Amino acid sequence: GSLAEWYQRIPTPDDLTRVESLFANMQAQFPQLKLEFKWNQPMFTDHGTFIMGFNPSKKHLAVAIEPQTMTRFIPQIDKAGYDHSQIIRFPWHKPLDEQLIHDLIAYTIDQKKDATTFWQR
Amino acid sequence: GSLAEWYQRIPTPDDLTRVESLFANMQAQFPQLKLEFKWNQPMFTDHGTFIMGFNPSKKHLAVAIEPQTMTRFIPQIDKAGYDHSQIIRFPWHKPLDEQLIHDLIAYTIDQKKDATTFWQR
Ligand SMILES: [Cl-]
Ligand SMILES: [Cl-]
Ligand SMILES: [Cl-]
Questions:
Q1: CA B75 – CA B55 distance, rounded (Å)
Q2: CA B114 to chain centre
Q3: Which of A92, B20, B95, B105 is deepest in the core (most CB within 10 A)?
Q4: Residue extents of the structural domains in chain B
């Protein structure tokens, strides 16, 4: 894909305006950032390192951030009223590491032993 | 929707068998888990708290895990050779909080100042 085509996956003209303004404002606020197009999506990078990625869907703009950033901001993201998701991609065409999946479950079960809410806050 | 309807979203018979076996194997290993259907996807829960979510796409099974779990397991996920993603959903119909996006970028920039890889490892 190209960057021209990605912009065309944004559902409506007002949605495109929102993304264009966001990009422009963030570039103005962080002049060192490079807006690259990599693995078929726009990403801000800084001195050859990932900062943020972007992908549209029918109902939302998905903003991609690093694991440590997500961890640090959970309280502030929840307060702002936005849902978040952390996923591992298991390709259909590759083996499924069930030991890994098992270990993720076991660790989470242990950490949430005394949880009083459905989601980690 | 429903769990039946969700299973129909899995793209091939072999992919369906994979998902069926995975659920069965994890339920056998963790007999306390309930497989619930919430917010249009299957989720393992334990004593009413979230443990793991699932969703198919054309190319992969997406396994949803909590932020603390993703953070803990990055080295093991990378070693296993799977990609991972952490996203915030900014709905098109709701205001976009640019201060939050600014703060996320600023924090990530500071954290990556001395980074020697593209992605957090
Ligand atoms: Cl909750
Ligand atoms: Cl571990
Ligand atoms: Cl890397």
A1: 23
A2: 28
A3: B105
A4: 1-81, 82-113
Query: Which two three-digit tokens encode residue A80?
Result: 């702002």
Cβ–Cβ gap B87/A64 under 8 Å: yes
| DSSP label at residue B30 | -
Alpha carbon distance A80, A76 (integer Å) = 6
> Which residues are CB-contacts of B61 (< 8 A; sequence separation ≥ 6)?
A89, A90, A92, A96, B15, B18, B19, B22, B54, B55
Q: Cβ of A107 and B76 within 8 Å? A: no
- Residue B86 class from Cβ within 10 Å (0-12 exposed, 13-18 middle, 19+ buried)? buried
Q: Specify burial of residue B54 (Cβ count, 10 A radius: 0-12, 13-18, 19+).
A: buried
Select from A47, A105, A117 the Cβ nearest to the Cβ of B51.
A105
Per CATH, is B1-81 categorized as 3.90.1150.200? yes
**Across the beta sheet with B34-38, what order do the strands follow?**
A34-38, A41-46, A49-56, A60-64, B84-91, A84-91, B60-64, B49-56, B41-46, B34-38
Quick one: fold of A82-113?
1.20.5
Phi and psi at residue B54, to the nearest 5°: -135, 145
Chain A CB within 8 Å of residue B50 CB: yes
Please, are residues A33 and A51 in contact by the beta-carbon 8 Å criterion? yes
Q: Does A60 touch chain B (CB under 8 A)?
A: yes
Give me the numbers of helices (H) and strands (E) for chain A, helices first please.
4, 5
Name the packing angle between helices B98-111 and A13-29 (round to 10°). 40
Q: Determination technique for this PDB entry?
A: X-ray
